[PDB]
């Protein structure tokens, strides 16, 4: 089973940068699941951002060099986290953020082509707003 | 304008899971395997990155059977002593609700219990017996040979070759062959024995670390010998000796790589806390003997990251032949002991670990020692390897001409 | 001798082709009696599962041959790709994650086709 | 999700159950994460804990995939809830006095 | 990319019924690398349907689906009460995918 | 596997070819070597017969395949009928009852084709 | 069964052809298991040989036939010469004692046409 649960949700001054963490309860290791990064808009449709496979850290290529991602594996008193680097704080970056897992172990699963995946399970997101 | 065209020889991989047939080089082996093969035997892959776990594997089960079917044929003991739980008389038990009176006087006596939804009584009911087998006793020799564990038609095993692999996570240099390397059927609690080892460095695992209820398996690359002999004035009297500032270097660099990676915290070791005795002792058959040493001082290396017998450390040892089975649930009686003396040097390769994670003021961790399963005494030299199926067809869409 | 049907893997397919061709023209006790009639059968049921597979080629017309041309045209809806990225971009481990339920069409139009 | 209730002193049950038929390894906890039991195989162990020699399971069910725990000399130091781990089945049953 | 759009963008459904989504594509998606998505008000949207016509385990037996070369339909049946939920169609052919639009379901 | 050759046997011909289709793609002391030896005695002749009929039918041009496309036509004296009572009104029996001496002359013919 | 290849040496090619298509058409102790596994092992390794030479016509597209037609053409350097004295005037001995660099040479070629 996969419990997987963020951090705190948190308001933004624009103009910084904000390090989203997100733990992973019930994964053996990031070698055999891949962490994917998704956005929501306040009352828009979801948004892609990111991916941990094969320990390859990417944003995507409409979003480079802002937001990229870092992920630890599970140590000794830790479970595996993964943690998400925002620079340049804008207004319109307000929004839900999620992090996913899937299972990588099989080749023929069919939740995962070269990198370009479904999502298996999702956290409970952190809402980041502007004053 | 182009259609369909069929290929053959097509490298495509599956993983199903078969039975996978022996061996290397007179009751087993020649009954149950083949002879040898001229290795080497291996193809190098180049651009693949096949995804390996050792915890999910389908090799285990098929040795752990295999191995029940050695042992069952090789050292026969005399009275084996196995559980009999059933479901007397009669099938009364039914498809389920409540009321049924069996049991109380003898065994035929009326309880009539109250249920409705079920638990299980003495869920479902079982009155367990004890079949009682008395198997002879020759007093047979014994060898764990090599087992080269040999593919069957139209299947490969897949292998690793990075020297710090962790069992799970990918390994990118794959390599095929069509047969195992050395194996050999050691059984020991406590302790491994005749393993193989790491080639850069030692490694530590487990199913899943936190979790401070899966045997850490820690693997090494000094290869630690142990000697065991029975001396005299006993009859059952034996013991080991090990070499002090070999088992201080082993021990050093185990607390440097547990101290690297996951705490972070203070070290202490110990003995195993209890429970059925061979678990206690470092349990291990050699020639025919069930030799039970303790391993107590083995252990104590509360050490700072920074009166015992300190050079010839002897392991005072037992010779029991009332055993608890591994292969089942139960005991077994063996013939009786031996007259002279036996040679039992070895090689420590390796060590089944457990934590008690806590507590909050400590700081330290304790880290008795457990084992006592011989599937994970079979994880360590399943180490790389996973079968998959070949399927040779393949369609493509050519001109053709 | 069918050891080495897999040694291109990782790399594109007719790299894989030309390795195939390559590899294809590159290959008194009871003692005795125990360790002697394992061999054979262990050679018999390579013989059989080889033999197994040409008729299951030869059902197809394709008996023997590594490459064949059959007759079955498309569906349009079967990897609408160009050619260079068929044989360039993509090896076998990507298609057949692709198409399997139309691998098993393809298998039943090939019967069809075989028939008449 | 159950609560058992023994006075002092007496014997009392704990069950996991296990659909495999098997004896599989599975282990059981306490509150606050230190072992009781566990299998190893087809042996028995005890936990480092204030339970070394108290504890104890019948081992003949084991087969059957009922995985039993008796715990004796209840007293007012057993009053904490004791965790199955056998494959998922994370459950909480509770001991009073 | 390639562009995804899902319709009808919002209906109304009583208890018990079968609603037949479509999601449309700008290629032509051979190999049915589309998944389907639900989500309530709140909570995580969690996966319904991988490869097209493949159902995970954890959804119950009453949804399904079919392919239309540049179309996907998403099919209910048997609408309970719980199942009132926000949905998505991914895909996830090329790097990036992106979703649909949502189809909010009233009575 | 050869055991299920004759499972349409009273029916029609064509119905016996579908038949055919489905059918084939449908499918330690010294009594250890005495009830060993005698299995794989019985599957190596088994494969040397189908190999020789293998070789029969491709002496001809037809390895491998159930049915193939010869080149040999016709004699109008060989069973001048139409094709729908040649499908649908008669079995194996009256035909191999039929044309016997003209199966030795088609055996001949064929040959001589094969080569030429 | 592969003894007699060779019974029209010395004869000229044409009949050496006809008299391949005319002889392919014509054709409890432990002494127990030590006399019967060798013709066994015979067997299997007769078998293996025939079959390593059925692939090995197989990769060029020829097999089960034992005569028919591959797809590359002349160099016009390769004993070029009057099909009267090819099939009348020579023996094999003479042309496997002529060509042998240029037979290498057409192996190469016949694999490069059988792949494509
Ligand atoms: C069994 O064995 C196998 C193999 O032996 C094991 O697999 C190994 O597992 C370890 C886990 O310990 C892995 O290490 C981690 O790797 C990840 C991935 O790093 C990649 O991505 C990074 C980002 O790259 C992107 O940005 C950069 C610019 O920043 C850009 O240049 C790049 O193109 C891309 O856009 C790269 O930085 C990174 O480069 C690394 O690799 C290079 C070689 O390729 C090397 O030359 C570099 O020097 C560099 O080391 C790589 O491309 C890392 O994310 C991760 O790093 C975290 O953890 C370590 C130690 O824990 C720590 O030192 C780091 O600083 C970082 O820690 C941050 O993240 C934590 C997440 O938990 C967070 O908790 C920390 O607080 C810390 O956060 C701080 O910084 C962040 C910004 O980073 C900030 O947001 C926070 O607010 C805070 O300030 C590890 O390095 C191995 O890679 C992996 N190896 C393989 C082959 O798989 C397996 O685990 C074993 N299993 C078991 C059970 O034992
Ligand atoms: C790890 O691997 C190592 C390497 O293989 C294992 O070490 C081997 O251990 C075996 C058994 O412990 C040992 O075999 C004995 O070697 C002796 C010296 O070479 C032999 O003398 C002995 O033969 C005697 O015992 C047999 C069984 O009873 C008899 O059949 C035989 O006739 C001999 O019996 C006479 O001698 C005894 C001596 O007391 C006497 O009591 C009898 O009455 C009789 O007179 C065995 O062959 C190997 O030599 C060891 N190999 C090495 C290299 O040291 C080790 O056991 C493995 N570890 C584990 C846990 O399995
Ligand atoms: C490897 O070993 C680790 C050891 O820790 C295992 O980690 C445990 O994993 C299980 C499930 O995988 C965890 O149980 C779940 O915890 C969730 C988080 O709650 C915890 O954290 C909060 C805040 O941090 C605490 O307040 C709380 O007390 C918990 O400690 C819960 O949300 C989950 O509850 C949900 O599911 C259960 C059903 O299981 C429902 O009954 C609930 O109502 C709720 O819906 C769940 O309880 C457990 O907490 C982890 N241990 C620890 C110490 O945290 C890994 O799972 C294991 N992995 C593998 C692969 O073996
Ligand atoms: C190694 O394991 C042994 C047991 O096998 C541990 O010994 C036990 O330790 C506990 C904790 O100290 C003892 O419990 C209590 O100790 C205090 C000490 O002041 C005492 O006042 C209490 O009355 C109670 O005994 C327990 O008695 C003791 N048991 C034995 C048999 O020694 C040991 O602690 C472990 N090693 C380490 C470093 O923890
Ligand atoms: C199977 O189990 C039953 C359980 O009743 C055995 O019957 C007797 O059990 C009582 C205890 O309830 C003992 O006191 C008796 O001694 C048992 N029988 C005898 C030997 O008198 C029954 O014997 C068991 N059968 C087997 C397999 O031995
Ligand atoms: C990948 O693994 C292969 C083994 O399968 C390595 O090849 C060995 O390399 C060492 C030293 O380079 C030689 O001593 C061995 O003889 C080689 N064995 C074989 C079978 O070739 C290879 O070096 C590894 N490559 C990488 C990059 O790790
Ligand atoms: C193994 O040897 C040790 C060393 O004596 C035994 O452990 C205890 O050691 C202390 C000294 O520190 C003694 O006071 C105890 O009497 C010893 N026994 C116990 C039960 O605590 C240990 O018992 C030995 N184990 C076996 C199986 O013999
Ligand atoms: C541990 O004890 C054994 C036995 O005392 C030591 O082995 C002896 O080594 C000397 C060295 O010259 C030999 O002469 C003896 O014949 C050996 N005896 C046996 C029984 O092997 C061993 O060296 C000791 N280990 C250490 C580190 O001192
Ligand atoms: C073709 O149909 C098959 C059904 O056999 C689908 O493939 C499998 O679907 C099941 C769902 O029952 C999954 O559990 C499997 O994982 C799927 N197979 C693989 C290899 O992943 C497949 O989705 C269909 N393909 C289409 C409709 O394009
Ligand atoms: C693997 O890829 C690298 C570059 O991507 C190439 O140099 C190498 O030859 C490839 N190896 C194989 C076996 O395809
Ligand atoms: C164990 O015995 C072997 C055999 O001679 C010896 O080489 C080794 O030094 C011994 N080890 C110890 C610690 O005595
Ligand atoms: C191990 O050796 C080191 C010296 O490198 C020494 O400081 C330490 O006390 C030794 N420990 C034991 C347990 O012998
Ligand atoms: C590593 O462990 C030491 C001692 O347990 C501790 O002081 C230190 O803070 C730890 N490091 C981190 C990064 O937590
Ligand atoms: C450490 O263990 C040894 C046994 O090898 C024992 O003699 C010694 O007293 C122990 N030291 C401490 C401090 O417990
Ligand atoms: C280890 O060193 C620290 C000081 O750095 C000390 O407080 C602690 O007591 C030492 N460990 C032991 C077991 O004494
Ligand atoms: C083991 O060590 C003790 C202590 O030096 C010694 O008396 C005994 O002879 C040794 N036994 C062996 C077999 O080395
Ligand atoms: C024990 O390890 C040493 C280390 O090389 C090796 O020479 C010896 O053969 C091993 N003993 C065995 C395998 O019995
Ligand atoms: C895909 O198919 C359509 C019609 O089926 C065709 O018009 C188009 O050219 C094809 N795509 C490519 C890249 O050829
Ligand atoms: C029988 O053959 C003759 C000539 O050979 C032909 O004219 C006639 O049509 C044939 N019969 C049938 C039914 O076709
Ligand atoms: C080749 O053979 C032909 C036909 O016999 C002949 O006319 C020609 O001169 C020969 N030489 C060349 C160069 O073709």
Redesign the interface.
């Known amino acids: 089973?996969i419990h997987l649960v963020q951090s705190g949700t948190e308001v933004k001054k624009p103009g910084s940068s904000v390090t989203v963490s997100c733990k992973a309860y019930g994964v053996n290791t990031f070698g055999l699941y891949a962490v994917n990064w998704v956005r929501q808009a306040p009352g828009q449709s979801l948004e892609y951002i990111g991916q941990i496979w094969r320990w390859k850290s990417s944003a995507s290529h409409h979003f480079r060099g802002r937001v990229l991602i870092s992920a630890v594996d599970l140590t000794g008193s830790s479970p595996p986290i993964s943690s998400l680097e925002i620079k340049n704080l804008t207004s319109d970056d307000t929004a839900v953020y999620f992090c996913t897992t899937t299972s990588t172990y099989d080749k023929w699963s069919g939740l995962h082509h070269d990198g370009v995946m479904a999502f298996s399970s999702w956290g409970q997101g952190t809402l980041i707003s502007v004053s | 304008k182009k259609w369909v065209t069929v290929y053959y020889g097509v490298p495509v991989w599956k993983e199903a899971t078969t039975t996978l047939f022996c061996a290397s080089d007179n009751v087993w082996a020649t009954h149950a395997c083949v002879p040898t093969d001229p290795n080497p035997q291996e193809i190098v892959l180049g651009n693949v990155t096949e995804n390996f776990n050792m915890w999910k594997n389908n090799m285990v089960e098929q040795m752990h059977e295999d191995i029940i079917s050695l042992w069952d044929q090789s050292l026969k003991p005399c009275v084996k002593l196995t559980?009999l739980?059933v479901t007397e008389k009669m099938e009364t038990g039914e498809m389920k609700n409540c009321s049924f009176n069996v049991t109380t006087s003898i065994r035929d006596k009326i309880k009539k219990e109250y249920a409705l939804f079920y638990?299980?009584d003495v869920?479902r009911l079982?009155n367990?017996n004890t079949s009682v087998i008395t198997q002879a006793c020759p007093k047979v020799s014994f060898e764990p040979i090599p087992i080269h564990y040999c593919a069957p038609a139209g299947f490969a095993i897949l292998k690793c070759n990075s020297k710090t692999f962790n069992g799970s996570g990918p390994c990118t240099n794959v390599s095929t062959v069509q047969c195992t390397h050395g194996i050999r059927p050691v059984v020991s609690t406590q302790l491994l024995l005749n393993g193989s080892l790491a080639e850069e460095e030692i490694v530590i695992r487990s199913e899943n670390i936190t979790d401070?209820?899966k045997?850490i398996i820690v693997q090494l690359n000094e290869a630690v010998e142990i000697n065991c002999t029975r001396p005299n004035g006993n009859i059952r009297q034996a013991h080991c000796n090990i070499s002090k500032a070999r088992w201080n270097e082993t021990l050093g660099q185990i607390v440097a790589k547990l101290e690297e990676q996951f705490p972070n915290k203070t070290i202490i070791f110990?003995h195993?806390?209890?429970?059925?005795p061979?678990?206690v002792t470092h349990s291990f058959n050699c020639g025919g003997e069930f030799f039970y040493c303790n391993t107590t001082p083995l252990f104590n290396s509360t050490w700072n990251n920074t009166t015992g017998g300190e050079q010839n450390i002897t392991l005072q040892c037992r010779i029991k032949q009332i055993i608890?089975?591994?292969?089942?649930?139960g005991k077994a009686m063996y013939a009786p002991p031996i007259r002279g003396q036996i040679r039992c040097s070895s090689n420590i390769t390796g060590l089944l670990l457990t934590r008690?994670?806590?507590?909050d003021q400590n700081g330290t961790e304790?880290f008795?020692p457990?084992?006592?399963?011989?599937?994970d005494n079979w994880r360590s030299e399943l180490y790389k390897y996973k079968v998959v199926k070949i399927e040779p067809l393949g369609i493509a869409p050519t001109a053709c001409k | 001798f069918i050891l080495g049907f897999l040694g291109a893997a990782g790399s594109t397919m007719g790299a894989a082709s030309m390795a195939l061709t390559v590899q294809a023209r590159l290959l008194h006790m009871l003692q005795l009696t125990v360790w002697g009639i394992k061999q054979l059968q262990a050679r018999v049921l390579a013989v059989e599962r080889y033999l197994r597979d040409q008729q299951l080629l030869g059902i197809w017309g394709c008996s023997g041959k590594i490459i064949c041309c059959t007759n079955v045209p498309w569906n349009d809806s079967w990897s609408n790709k160009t050619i260079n990225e068929i044989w360039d971009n993509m090896t076998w481990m990507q298609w057949e994650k692709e198409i399997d339920n139309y691998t098993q069409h393809i298998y039943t139009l090939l019967e069809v086709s075989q028939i008449q | 999700k159950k609560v058992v209730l023994g006075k002092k002193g007496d014997t009392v049950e704990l069950?996991c159950?296990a659909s495999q038929k098997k004896?599989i390894?599975f282990?059981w906890?306490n509150s606050?994460?230190?072992?009781i039991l566990?299998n190893?195989?087809?042996?028995?162990?005890?936990?480092?804990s204030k339970l070394?020699?108290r504890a104890d399971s019948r081992?003949?069910?084991?087969?059957?995939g009922?995985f039993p725990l008796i715990i004796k000399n209840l007293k007012i130091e057993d009053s904490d809830t004791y965790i199955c781990?056998v494959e998922?089945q994370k459950e909480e049953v509770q001991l009073l006095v | 990319d390639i562009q995804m759009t899902q319709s009808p963008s919002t209906l109304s459904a009583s208890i018990g019924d079968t609603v037949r989504i479509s999601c449309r594509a700008s290629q032509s998606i051979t190999g049915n690398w589309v998944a389907w998505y639900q989500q309530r008000p709140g909570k995580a949207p969690r996966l319904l349907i991988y490869r097209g016509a493949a159902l995970l385990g954890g959804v119950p037996s009453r949804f399904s689906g079919s392919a239309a070369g540049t179309d996907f339909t998403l099919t209910i049946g048997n609408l309970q009460a719980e199942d009132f939920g926000t949905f998505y169609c991914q895909q996830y052919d090329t790097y990036p995918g992106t979703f649909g639009q949502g189809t909010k379901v009233e009575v």
């Open positions: 089973q | 559980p739980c638990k299980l869920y079982i367990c401070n209820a045997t110990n195993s806390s209890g429970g059925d061979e678990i608890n089975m591994w292969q089942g649930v008690d994670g806590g507590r304790t008795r457990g084992g006592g399963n011989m599937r | 069950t159950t004896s390894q282990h906890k606050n994460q230190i072992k566990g190893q195989g087809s042996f028995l162990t005890k936990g480092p070394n020699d081992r003949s069910l084991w087969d059957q009922n781990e998922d």
